Amino acid sequence: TLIELMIVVAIIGILAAIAIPQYQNYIAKSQVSRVMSETGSLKTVIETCILDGKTAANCELGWTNSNLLG
Amino acid sequence: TLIELMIVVAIIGILAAIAIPQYQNYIAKSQVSRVMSETGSLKTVIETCILDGKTAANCELGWTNSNLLG
């Protein structure tokens, strides 16, 4: 019947009109958190370089190129 | 039996004069709904591109041609 097909169309329209809960807030936050860890891994290597008096030029870091530029 | 034939003719004329309930409102609506689905399926791609930082050229669409240009 036509009414059944129109009900199916209405259900399709209802499902297509779902609300996306602004996922940008999540992923970006996670990315920031990741950077917070990575820069944190550079604490001790800097701190010891501060304590022993080693200069900036010869204070080597174990830093690796991160996927995020941060 | 001429009156019977004239009654038959009157019934034929009555049946032929049925009112068509403007079906154009249905089909088009359904078509629009279908587009509302298909383009919607692209959203989950574009966001994943935007949150990734990829450019327009690097964003790969899993789009297939639709018999409706929309």
Description:
Chain A is mostly helical. The first copy, chain A, has helices at residues 2-16, 24-40, 43-52. The radius of gyration of chain A is 26 Å and the shape is rod-shaped. The first copy, chain A, has 3 helices and no strands. The A-B interface holds A 2, 5-6, 9, 12-13, 16-17, 20, 23-24, 27-28 and B 26, 29-30, 33-34, 36-37, 40, 43, 47, 50-51. The PDB classes it as cell adhesion. Keywords: T4P, Competence, cell adhesion. The entry is titled "Acinetobacter GP16 Type IV pilus".
Q: Quick gist of this model?
A:
Chain A is an all-alpha fold and 70 residues long. Chain A has three helices and no strands. In chain A, 60% of the residues lie in helices and 0% in strands.
Strand % of chain A is under 5%
User: What share of the residues of chain A lie within helices?
Assistant: 55-70%
Biggest sheet statistics of chain A: none
The backbone outline of chain A, from C-alpha atoms, is rod-shaped
- The H-and-E topology of chain A, N to C, reads as HHH
Quaternary organization: part of a larger assembly
What is the total tally of β strands of chain A? Answer: 0
Radius of gyration computed on alpha carbons of chain A: 26 Å
> How many DSSP H or I helices of chain A?
3
End-to-end CA span of chain A? 60 Å
Biggest interface, and residues per chain? A-B, 13 and 12 residues
Name the structural class of chain A. mainly alpha
Protein name (chains A, B): Fimbrial protein
Family (chains A, B): Belongs to the N-Me-Phe pilin family.
Subunit structure (chains A, B): The pili are polar flexible filaments of about 5.4 nanometers diameter and 2.5 micrometers average length; they consist of only a single polypeptide chain arranged in a helical configuration of five subunits per turn in the assembled pilus.
Organism (chains A, B): Acinetobacter higginsii
